[PDB]
């Protein structure tokens, strides 16, 4: 998980980083400067994680590419309402115990942390209204409220 400048004064231990909402991991930290867009960074991370899926189990294999496509749409301002809620649901449903191995919980850790800490950058990519359908001539659509 991503951490902010306020978490820099934390000892690099498993217990201390664990209660900050992240993991100690390999303890080889990566710094992100202000010139890096968080949506593009998480898109790069999720592209890596989705293409490195072993393909055994459904949530990682078929839900990481969905997050990749959502982040790609958010990158060029083609996001639609419900995309961030979809990303949050993907983070919740790809956590530990839901997938076969721990590849996908690690995949969704930076996505959920970046949404938690930098939600204004993910909201900035939502420009178009939601459209999943096209009109079919002769059939009046069911306009849900």
């Amino acid at each position: 998980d991503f951490l902010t400048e306020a978490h820099l004064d934390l000892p690099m231990e498993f217990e201390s980083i664990g209660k900050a909402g992240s993991r100690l991991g390999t303890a080889l930290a990566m710094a992100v400067d202000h010139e890096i867009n968080m949506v593009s960074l998480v898109r790069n991370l999720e592209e890596f994680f989705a293409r490195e899926s072993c393909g055994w189990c459904t949530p990682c294999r078929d839900g990481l590419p969905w997050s990749v496509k959502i982040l790609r749409a958010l990158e060029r301002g083609e996001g639609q309402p419900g995309d961030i809620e979809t990303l949050e649901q993907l983070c919740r449903f790809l956590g530990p115990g839901k997938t076969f191995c721990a590849h996908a919980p690690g995949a969704v850790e930076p996505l959920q942390s970046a949404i938690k800490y930098f939600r204004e950058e993910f909201e900035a990519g939502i420009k178009q209204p939601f459209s999943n359908t096209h009109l079919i001539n002769g059939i009046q659509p069911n306009l849900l409220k």
């Binding site: 359908t133 079919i136 069911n142 849900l144 409220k145």
Partner: peptide, 23 residues
């Protein structure tokens, strides 16, 4: 009222036709 002519329930029979024809 303005709104749907079919409920948003999975047992709505049949589903809305346009979504049936593309989803």
């Amino acid at each position: 009222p303005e709104g749907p002519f079919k409920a948003d329930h999975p047992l709505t029979t049949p589903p809305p036709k346009e979504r049936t024809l593309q989803h």
